[PDB]
Amino acid sequence: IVGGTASVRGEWPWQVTLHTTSPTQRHLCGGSIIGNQWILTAAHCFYGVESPKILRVYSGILNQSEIKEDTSFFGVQEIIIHDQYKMAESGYDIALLKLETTVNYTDSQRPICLPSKGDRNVIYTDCWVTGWGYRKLRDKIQNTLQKAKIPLVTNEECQKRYRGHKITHKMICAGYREGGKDACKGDSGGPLSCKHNEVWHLVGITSWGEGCAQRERPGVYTNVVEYVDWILEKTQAV
Numbered sequence: 001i002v003g004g005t006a007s008v009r010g011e012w013p014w015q016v017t018l019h020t021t022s023p024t025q026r027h028l029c030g031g032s033i034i035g036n037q038w039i040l041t042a043a044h045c046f047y048g049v050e051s052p053k054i055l056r057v058y059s060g061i062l063n064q065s066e067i068k069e070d071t072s073f074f075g076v077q078e079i080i081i082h083d084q085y086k087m088a089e090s091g092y093d094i095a096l097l098k099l100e101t102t103v104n105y106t107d108s109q110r111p112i113c114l115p116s117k118g119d120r121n122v123i124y125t126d127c128w129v130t131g132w133g134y135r136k137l138r139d140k141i142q143n144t145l146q147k148a149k150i151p152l153v154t155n156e157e158c159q160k161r162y163r164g165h166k167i168t169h170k171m172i173c174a175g176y177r178e179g180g181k182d183a184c185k186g187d188s189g190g191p192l193s194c195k196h197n198e199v200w201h202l203v204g205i206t207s208w209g210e211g212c213a214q215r216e217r218p219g220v221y222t223n224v225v226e227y228v229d230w231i232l233e234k235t236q237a238v
């Protein structure tokens with residue numbers, strides 16, 4: 001996250017850090033708790049990941065330094081990638097991780113509400129992007145979870161900023177016309193959370209952009225409302 005600040009412990013209880021074990025243990029991508037055995041993340045985070053066996057999900061983490069070999073985590077039983085996914089820039093940058101065990105909800109770890117089918121009409125004014133990603137271009141994974149308040153922008157306005165690309169309605173953009181605040185490398189899969197009627201909702205999933213936090217280049221997110229049926233299909237399967 002560029003131009004944001006250190007989070008407070010327990011501020012984003014749905015935020016997870018998705019780690020890989022092979023080659024070495026490290027943070028791979030963000031994610032969100034959406035069910036007691038479900039993580040909503042981005043499909044591009046699995047490029048080259050040949051097995052769910054090398055994955056570890058950590059919830060209730062503020063600092064990456066909290067994670068050692070003795071730290072409790074959730075194993076990944078199944079990686080569910082949208083079957084229309086080709087690449088981040090073309091859309092369908094969404095995936096579901098079925099966890100091996102149940103997440104027991106606490107004040108440190110609980111789920112974020114998915115948007116409503118009637119919430120297509122709503123205008124969100126308080127949207128925040130969070131993650132352990134880069135705060136600058138050539139950087140490293142951050143220790144402390146970072147946060148930034150970013151305004152949502154219309155599809156038409158986002159299309160004007162992305163000549164040569166096709167901003168689909170399954171995409172949602174957020175950014176300041178002068179830049180300065182955005183998600184960056186390492187933040188993918190993580191949430192774009194909007195508070196509406198004192199209720200937080202998972203509006204977006206960090207996906208792509210042109211560099212990070214540049215002027216007239218708002219970050220592109222997976223538009224969660226447009227995937228509620230797909231999510232229910234995968235999670236509520238008989």
Ligand SMILES: C[C@]1(c2ccccc2)C[C@@H](c2cccc(-c3ccc(C(N)=O)cc3C(=O)O)c2)Nc2ccc(C(=N)N)cc21
Pocket residue numbers: 027028029044045133141182183184185186187188206207208209210211212213218219220
């Ligand atoms: C386009 C892109 C970008 C372009 C130019 C400069 C900086 C970033 C890169 C894209 C991407 C694609 C494939 C892999 C990675 C990746 C690699 C390593 C690790 C790791 N943990 O070591 C994590 C990740 C991860 O998936 O973040 C990232 N993700 C993204 C998301 C949001 C914004 C944005 N500005 N809103 C920009 C970007």
